[PDB]
Amino acid sequence: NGPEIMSKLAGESESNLRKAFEEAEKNAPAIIFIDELDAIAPKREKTHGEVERRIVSQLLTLMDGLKQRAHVIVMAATNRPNSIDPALRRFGRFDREVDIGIPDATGRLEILQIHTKNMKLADDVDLEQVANETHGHVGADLAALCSEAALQAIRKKMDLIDLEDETIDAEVMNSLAVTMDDFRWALSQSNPSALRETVVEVPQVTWEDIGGLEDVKRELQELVQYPVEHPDKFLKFGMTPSKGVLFYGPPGCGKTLLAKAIANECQANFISIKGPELLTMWFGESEANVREIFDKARQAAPCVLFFDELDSIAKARGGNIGDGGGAADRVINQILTEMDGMSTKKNVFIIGATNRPDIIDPAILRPGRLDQLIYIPLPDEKSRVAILKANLRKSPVAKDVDLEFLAKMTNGFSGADLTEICQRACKLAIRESIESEIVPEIRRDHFEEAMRFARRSVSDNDIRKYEMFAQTLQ
Amino acid sequence: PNRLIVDEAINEDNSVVSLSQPKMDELQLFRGDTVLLKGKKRREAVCIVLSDDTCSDEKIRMNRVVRNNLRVRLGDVISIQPCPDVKYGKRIHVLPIDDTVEGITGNLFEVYLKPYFLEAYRPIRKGDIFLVRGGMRAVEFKVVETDPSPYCIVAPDTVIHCEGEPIKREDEEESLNEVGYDDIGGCRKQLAQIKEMVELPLRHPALFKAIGVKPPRGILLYGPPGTGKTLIARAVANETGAFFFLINGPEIMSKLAGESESNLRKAFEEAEKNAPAIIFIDELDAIAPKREKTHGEVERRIVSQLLTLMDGLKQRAHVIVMAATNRPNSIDPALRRFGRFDREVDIGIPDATGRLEILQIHTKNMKLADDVDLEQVANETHGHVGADLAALCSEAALQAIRKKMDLIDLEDETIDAEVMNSLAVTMDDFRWALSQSNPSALRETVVEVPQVTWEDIGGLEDVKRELQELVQYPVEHPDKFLKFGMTPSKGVLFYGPPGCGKTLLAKAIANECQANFISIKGPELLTMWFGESEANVREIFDKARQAAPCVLFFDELDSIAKARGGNIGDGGGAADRVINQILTEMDGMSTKKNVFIIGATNRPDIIDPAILRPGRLDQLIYIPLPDEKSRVAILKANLRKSPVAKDVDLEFLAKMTNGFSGADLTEICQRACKLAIRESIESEIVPEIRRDHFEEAMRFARRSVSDNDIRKYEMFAQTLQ
Amino acid sequence: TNEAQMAAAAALARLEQKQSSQDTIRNQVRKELQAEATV
Ligand SMILES: Nc1ncnc2c1ncn2[C@@H]1O[C@H](COP(=O)(O)OP(=O)(O)O)[C@@H](O)[C@H]1O
Ligand SMILES: Nc1ncnc2c1ncn2[C@@H]1O[C@H](COP(=O)(O)OP(=O)(O)O)[C@@H](O)[C@H]1O
Ligand SMILES: Nc1ncnc2c1ncn2[C@@H]1O[C@H](COP(=O)(O)OP(=O)(O)O)[C@@H](O)[C@H]1O
């Protein structure tokens, strides 16, 4: 490990590193694990000390000596492949890389199950519920979570039995059960160490969650699935698969869900870039981060890289008024460059979305970029019914609720607006249920009362804007 | 049988112990009865038992003086028994301790023991230690001989003796002036959190080494200088009995290469030999600052040496290493990885309540005049930390001393106890020192505990209920939200005329929910924008997370929009550096952190609509000017404790103040009171605020919200439906 | 017994002195009276 080698004086760090390789050969087959590699051989640009430069050279020569040290494999751990001397990653030495990443909800449950094998849990403990709540946690944090929950249960009993001796009675621990209240307390005390890291996972959104848009669902399958499900037909007909599609239309119509749902069915990782992140790069003149996003997309391939609020910068520059410049800017130019250099052989599909297509840099729509365009209109009557039922799929909706009637009335409402009705009716049912204890289902009165506050968010002035653009594209 | 756990006390009286009512009936004693407590080494103490509504059923609340007499520590278990046959004594002989009476001379009985014992009816046992404060000293005494045995109650006719040399302190008896938990004022929530983490493995080492649950090995404390980071570390070690080893940056950094590494390693070896032990590293940023900030080989090596020593704690059982820094991100991030220093406690800055507690602690030995008001000082000392309030008390003491010493002219090697005992520090001495003191944290972020209740807010009855549904129900009734698939809102924005209680609503709901309150003001958002330091937005939300449950109140959301021209604006859009960071933090914050975001603005028409999307401040509450019944309620709330005369017609006043906001009704109430007081003093050159005083106030108060503004706010609210 | 009952009265009196609206209102008026006296 870094600290063990770096804490040594000049002439001791190089000797100890050499001895480690010699011992592994003597005991071959052997594995040498170097943790905190960035502490031993950081990128040369970050260090100028005579000792630090020499130990880098010593590690490089020892790695090259592995041609003679038969059956010795050297593994290293770092936080970022770009934090270390690039020489280490040249042919030979450390020429293989594995991306461990962050466990998703399924992996987190598995970790919780492992670190509780020895723990007696009460019947009210639900580790799957915990795994869904522990967003941003890594295995080190879930292990700490189990420890804190166990210690809470211990404290509560130990202060009551008052048995102080050199050893602990097995029966006392064996009968101690950890309840859900102790896990919930530990969750409030635990603080995730990876909360600000990029989240790359297969989304849980499925096609059953999206009302209407039957033809768009099929179109995405043709664009995303067929190029890899039937590659022999694309070769036969000389077809070049599209690299991505831009969605445009009113807000709150499911543009994000479409990108997630296709990623889910394809079992591909979904990467979400949001407007504020594009604006952060624009304002801070840190557009270089775009290259890391596209590189992560390749690392996580097969994946779908979704750029939301693609117009966020154009609007930040004035949008309807704008300024003296053109559509091109720092961030979009890096995106255009990365897309041009990306091959379809990496199974990375790019999807964009905008609410103002009239101000998108036309370059992004040229062949080789987001050449496909799909219009997502406000839902029609049959779609609004599907949207209400999809949003209420998990709610205890009473049999007296006429969802088709609501769809017939809410003619100007967007999909997001129909959700507010569904959630408002749920809140009213919750209020009624709570009051009864001072109810089993959401009653028609709750939906009709919700309609008193619900309003359409998309006006006719903005609908025409989208219709005129959609007509312009024919 | 009658075995209870020893806990901390609130009552500062050395002869008083508190037990919960159910034990008063199970032990069959009356309130104020005399009981004996059985401690360690066949020792006991006699005290008077009172009842309260805060003691735990199975605990006994006692202070440090009683615990030391029993040779027990917090968390231990003692036996309690009644002794109703205690009688009066006639002779009690008390002598001072040699380690506390030094440099001072005079009649110790007249200064200390007489007011302590005279008509005090204190239970006393031979060998008891007790503390009498006064004269800017803390002087403890031991009881050496009594006629009755082994205990008695001192009577008004008891003769108190004090003849002989000072008593040499026993090596197993800790001084009462040592740092303990009762020396810490504010930041009590952090102290409690730390105690839970460390006291278990330190008091019960046999528990952890026998089970599969590992203890914490390191805790990082951080906050501005002078906030008690070291004070806590010492109090914990002294109360639990763990060996305390002190490290500080300058001591290690001043050493040569080959000496700094060995001295740091030795500190860890010594703690293990004396385990259980606590190693406190102060000024951690001086030993292991972020590596990007250092260029020398020695500094990089000592960081690696600290990292390896921290990792060695897997073998050094029962050793906990605590460190103090100013910022959690000023040090090598490696230290904060799993293990090492993987626990974090934000000490921060005490609020007005904590500052009052600190002033009371550092004045315990001071004689204060009747005009001294420490609560008024605590409210004025914004931006001060505990070290500033301690300096304030010391400076006030020295000013009072100079005034008397230059007049009495008594020059000797020792100081007369009577001279100091009769020296009082007045408001002029605290006011002088306060003007000289300069806050060390003038512009730091302070997390406060709200003191506003619903009874302080007139009107808005429907808003109060709505906010409880938004803030309390998601956690009070989580089974209903899961049943109905409801997603709780992350926040709410208030809009409407100024002076209508928008801020009070946020504080009142935070108070009832027992949540912390964080206030961010417009000028802070403007500072971040202009100075291109929008990264500081993360620090705001990071404190909100660590301080959870809390309510994060963003005032003057439009401060930047107005700085950008407001109604005219510029060539750009609504987005800017600061709002983008705020929106990013909001999107990345989960409802499971129990952090509720509240905003407020007086110009909702120019707020970036992005902040009102689902997932942000999607809920909008309109707070109009109070109506007829609300204005009366506001007047009653502001006058809840005022001596209002029976001739005051609060409904008539409310009918006249049709265009007034709640802020304007308060000025009327305060002015009418001041006018009544003015008349009072004039009569000597009155007991109640008369109708004439409210009518006179009506001639000076004005409405702050004009008719043009009311229509603007009402039309906006109507547009929102 | 009666010696403990006299100790009970002393312990309760100190508790009430430490816990202690009338003195806050009177002290706030006293401060305003002195300011109006000198202004
Ligand atoms: N076609 C649809 N089917 C079901 N729900 C929808 C649909 N369109 C919008 N919604 C609802 O609106 C909300 C916002 O959708 P989203 O795709 O996030 O909008 P945007 O893409 O503009 O961000 C979703 O949570 C969803 O419940
Ligand atoms: N919360 C507090 N309660 C009481 N005293 C405090 C508090 N915070 C600071 N102080 C006082 O201020 C000083 C803090 O000094 P110290 O603990 O050495 O701080 P540092 O670690 O910055 O050197 C001490 O005199 C201490 O009594
Ligand atoms: N509804 C109300 N009830 C009682 N007092 C009020 C009310 N509204 C305003 N006030 C008075 O106005 C003052 C300012 O209130 P505050 O909530 O700080 O206004 P703002 O939110 O505009 O800053 C408070 O000190 C309070 O005494």
Numbering used by the authors:
A (entry chain B): 270 to 707, 728 to 763
B (entry chain A): 23 to 707, 728 to 763
C (entry chain G): 49 to 68, 75 to 93
Q: What does the original paper state about this entry?
A:
Finally, cryo-EM analysis of p97 incubated with ADP and the UBXD1 lariat and H4 mutants was performed to understand structural changes associated with these motifs. Density for VIM–H4 was identified in the lariat mutant structure (p97–UBXD1LX), and for the VIM, PUB, lariat and UBX in the H4 mutant structure (p97–UBXD1H4X, essentially identical to p97–UBXD1closed). The open-ring state of p97 was not observed in either dataset, indicating that interactions by the lariat and H4 are necessary for complete separation of the P1–P6 interface. In p97–UBXD1LX, the D2 domain, clockwise from the VIM–H4-bound protomer, exhibits strikingly weak density, probably because mutation of the lariat also results in the loss of UBX interactions, thereby localizing UBXD1-induced conformational changes to the D2 ring of p97. To explore this state further, 3D variability analysis was performed, revealing a variability mode in which H4 binding is correlated with destabilization of the adjacent D2. Mutation of the lariat decreases the D1–D1 distance relative to p97–UBXD1closed, and mutation of H4 shows no changes in D1–D1, further supporting that the D1 remodeling effects are driven by the lariat interaction. Intriguingly, the D2–D2 distance in p97–UBXD1LX is substantially increased to ~40 Å relative to p97–UBXD1closed (at ~36 Å). We postulate that this reflects a VIM–H4 interaction that is more pronounced when uncoupled from lariat binding to the D1, further suggesting that VIM–H4 interactions indeed contribute to ring opening through D2 displacement. Moreover, variability analysis of p97–UBXD1LX reveals that H4 interactions are dynamic and displace the adjacent D2 (of protomer P6), further supporting a direct role in disrupting the D2 interface.
